[PDB]
Protein backbone atom coordinates (compact mmCIF):
# COMPACT_ATOMS: atom_id res chain seq x y z
CA UNK A 1 0.00 0.00 0.00
CA UNK A 2 1.12 3.63 0.57
CA UNK A 3 3.97 3.85 3.08
CA UNK A 4 4.65 6.45 5.75
CA UNK A 5 6.83 7.49 8.68
CA UNK A 6 5.31 8.05 12.12
CA UNK A 7 7.16 11.14 13.30
CA UNK A 8 7.29 12.43 16.88
CA UNK A 9 6.12 15.98 17.56
CA UNK A 10 8.33 15.89 20.68
CA UNK A 11 11.71 15.60 18.86
CA UNK A 12 11.15 14.87 15.12
CA UNK A 13 12.56 11.34 15.52
CA UNK A 14 10.53 8.51 13.97
CA UNK A 15 9.18 5.13 15.08
CA UNK A 16 11.78 2.50 14.20
CA UNK A 17 11.99 -1.29 14.56
CA UNK A 18 15.24 -1.51 16.58
CA UNK A 19 18.17 -2.80 14.54
CA UNK A 20 15.93 -3.56 11.55
CA UNK A 21 15.22 -6.82 13.36
CA UNK A 22 12.54 -8.93 11.57
CA UNK A 23 11.96 -11.18 14.63
CA UNK A 24 8.81 -11.08 16.79
CA UNK A 25 9.38 -9.09 19.96
CA UNK A 26 11.77 -6.54 18.43
CA UNK A 27 11.43 -3.23 20.26
CA UNK A 28 9.83 -0.27 18.54
CA UNK A 29 11.97 2.77 19.48
CA UNK A 30 12.52 6.39 18.37
CA UNK A 31 15.38 6.99 15.91
CA UNK A 32 16.68 9.66 13.54
CA UNK A 33 14.82 9.53 10.23
CA UNK A 34 16.48 7.58 7.40
CA UNK A 35 15.67 7.61 3.65
CA UNK A 36 16.27 4.94 0.99
CA UNK A 37 16.02 1.12 1.09
CA UNK A 38 17.46 0.87 4.64
CA UNK A 39 14.49 2.92 5.91
CA UNK A 40 12.16 -0.11 5.66
CA UNK A 41 12.16 -0.54 9.47
CA UNK A 42 10.86 3.05 9.80
CA UNK A 43 8.06 2.60 7.23
CA UNK A 44 4.46 1.65 7.93
CA UNK A 45 1.15 1.20 6.11
CA UNK A 46 -2.47 0.71 7.11
CA UNK A 47 -4.14 -2.64 6.29
CA UNK A 48 -7.76 -3.05 5.17
CA UNK A 49 -8.96 -2.51 8.77
CA UNK A 50 -6.89 0.72 9.11
CA UNK A 51 -4.50 -1.22 11.34
CA UNK A 52 -0.84 -0.19 11.23
CA UNK A 53 1.69 -2.70 9.90
CA UNK A 54 5.42 -2.53 9.27
CA UNK A 55 6.85 -2.41 5.72
CA UNK A 56 9.65 -4.72 7.03
CA UNK A 57 7.69 -7.93 7.79
CA UNK A 58 4.02 -6.83 7.85
CA UNK A 59 4.04 -7.12 11.68
CA UNK A 60 1.60 -5.22 13.91
CA UNK A 61 2.49 -2.89 16.76
CA UNK A 62 1.99 -4.94 19.98
CA UNK A 63 1.33 -3.44 23.44
CA UNK A 64 1.06 -6.68 25.50
CA UNK A 65 4.14 -5.80 27.60
CA UNK A 66 5.27 -2.54 29.30
CA UNK A 67 7.09 -1.42 26.15
CA UNK A 68 5.85 -1.76 22.58
CA UNK A 69 7.28 -4.37 20.24
CA UNK A 70 6.51 -6.01 16.85
CA UNK A 71 4.28 -9.05 16.61
CA UNK A 72 2.53 -10.71 13.73
CA UNK A 73 -0.94 -9.18 13.29
CA UNK A 74 -3.75 -11.10 14.92
CA UNK A 75 -7.23 -9.55 14.59
CA UNK A 76 -8.27 -11.20 17.89
CA UNK A 77 -5.60 -9.46 20.03
CA UNK A 78 -6.88 -5.89 20.80
CA UNK A 79 -3.39 -4.77 21.82
CA UNK A 80 -2.10 -5.39 18.23
CA UNK A 81 -4.63 -3.06 16.51
CA UNK A 82 -3.27 0.50 16.37
CA UNK A 83 -4.71 3.08 14.00
CA UNK A 84 -3.94 6.65 12.98
CA UNK A 85 -6.27 9.00 14.86
CA UNK A 86 -5.52 12.68 14.16
CA UNK A 87 -2.03 13.26 15.43
CA UNK A 88 -2.15 10.20 17.72
CA UNK A 89 -1.57 6.45 17.25
CA UNK A 90 -4.61 5.03 19.02
CA UNK A 91 -5.79 1.54 20.03
CA UNK A 92 -8.59 0.55 17.62
CA UNK A 93 -10.86 -0.66 20.48
CA UNK A 94 -10.04 2.19 22.84
CA UNK A 95 -9.22 5.46 21.14
CA UNK A 96 -8.24 7.07 24.45
CA UNK A 97 -5.27 4.70 24.76
CA UNK A 98 -2.41 6.04 22.62
CA UNK A 99 1.27 5.44 21.85
CA UNK A 100 3.54 7.38 24.21
CA UNK A 101 7.32 7.97 24.31
CA UNK A 102 8.15 6.82 27.86
CA UNK A 103 8.96 9.72 30.26
CA UNK A 104 9.21 12.00 27.20
CA UNK A 105 12.74 10.63 26.64
CA UNK A 106 14.18 12.80 23.83
CA UNK A 107 17.23 10.62 23.14
CA UNK A 108 17.49 8.18 20.23
CA UNK A 109 16.63 4.62 21.18
CA UNK A 110 13.76 5.64 23.50
CA UNK A 111 11.00 3.13 24.20
CA UNK A 112 7.29 3.64 23.64
CA UNK A 113 4.34 2.57 25.81
CA UNK A 114 0.54 2.59 25.69
CA UNK A 115 -0.89 5.31 27.95
CA UNK A 116 -4.17 7.18 28.34
CA UNK A 117 -4.26 10.27 26.09
CA UNK A 118 -3.29 13.46 28.02
CA UNK A 119 -2.29 15.96 25.34
CA UNK A 120 1.48 15.91 26.00
CA UNK A 121 3.76 16.16 22.94
CA UNK A 122 5.20 12.70 23.79
CA UNK A 123 1.92 11.21 22.48
CA UNK A 124 1.69 13.37 19.29
CA UNK A 125 2.81 12.15 15.88
CA UNK A 126 3.05 13.53 12.30
CA UNK A 127 2.29 11.09 9.46
CA UNK A 128 4.88 11.60 6.71
CA UNK A 129 4.54 9.92 3.32
CA UNK A 130 7.59 7.88 2.28
C1 LIG B 1 19.99 0.27 8.97
C2 LIG B 1 19.80 -0.20 10.38
O3 LIG B 1 19.85 -1.39 10.69
N4 LIG B 1 19.63 0.79 11.26
C5 LIG B 1 19.15 0.59 12.60
C6 LIG B 1 18.44 1.87 13.08
O7 LIG B 1 17.31 2.14 12.25
C8 LIG B 1 18.02 1.71 14.54
O9 LIG B 1 17.03 0.68 14.63
C10 LIG B 1 19.26 1.34 15.37
C11 LIG B 1 18.99 1.16 16.85
O12 LIG B 1 20.23 1.01 17.58
O13 LIG B 1 19.82 0.14 14.84
C14 LIG B 1 20.33 0.32 13.53
O15 LIG B 1 20.96 -0.92 13.18
C1 LIG C 1 2.30 13.70 31.52
C2 LIG C 1 3.41 12.78 31.08
O3 LIG C 1 4.20 13.12 30.20
N4 LIG C 1 3.46 11.61 31.72
C5 LIG C 1 4.32 10.51 31.31
C6 LIG C 1 3.52 9.48 30.48
O7 LIG C 1 3.05 10.12 29.29
C8 LIG C 1 4.38 8.23 30.20
O9 LIG C 1 5.47 8.47 29.30
C10 LIG C 1 4.97 7.69 31.51
C11 LIG C 1 5.81 6.45 31.31
O12 LIG C 1 5.95 5.79 32.58
O13 LIG C 1 5.74 8.71 32.15
C14 LIG C 1 4.94 9.82 32.54
O15 LIG C 1 5.85 10.70 33.16
Which amino acid residue places its CA nearest to atom 11 of ligand 2? 102
Find out whether 9 and 15 touch, Cβ atoms under 8 Å: no
Residues 121 and 38: their CA atoms lie apart, in Å, by 27
**Domains annotated on the chain, with CATH:** 1-130 (2.80.10.50)
Q: What are phi and psi of 65, to 5 degrees?
A: -110, -175
Q: How far lies 87's CA from each of 41, 76, 122, 126, in Å?
A: 21, 25, 11, 6
Residues 27 and 69: their CA atoms lie apart, in Å, by 4
Q: What are residue 104's DSSP bridge partners?
A: none
**Cα of 103 to ligand 2 centre, how many Å?**
5
Residues 96 and 47: their CA atoms lie apart, in Å, by 21
Which amino acid residue places its CA nearest to atom 1 of ligand 1? 38
Query: Three-state DSSP class for 104?
Result: helix
Residues 48 and 40: their CA atoms lie apart, in Å, by 20
Q: How far lies 12's CA from each of 9, 61, 70, 112, 128, in Å?
A: 6, 20, 21, 15, 11
Solved with: X-ray
> Which numbered atom of ligand 1 lies nearest the CA of 41?
7
Amino acid sequence: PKFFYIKSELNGKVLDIEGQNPAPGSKIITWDQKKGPTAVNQLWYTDQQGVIRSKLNDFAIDASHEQIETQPFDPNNPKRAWIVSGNTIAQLSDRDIVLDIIKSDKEAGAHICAWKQHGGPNQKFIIESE
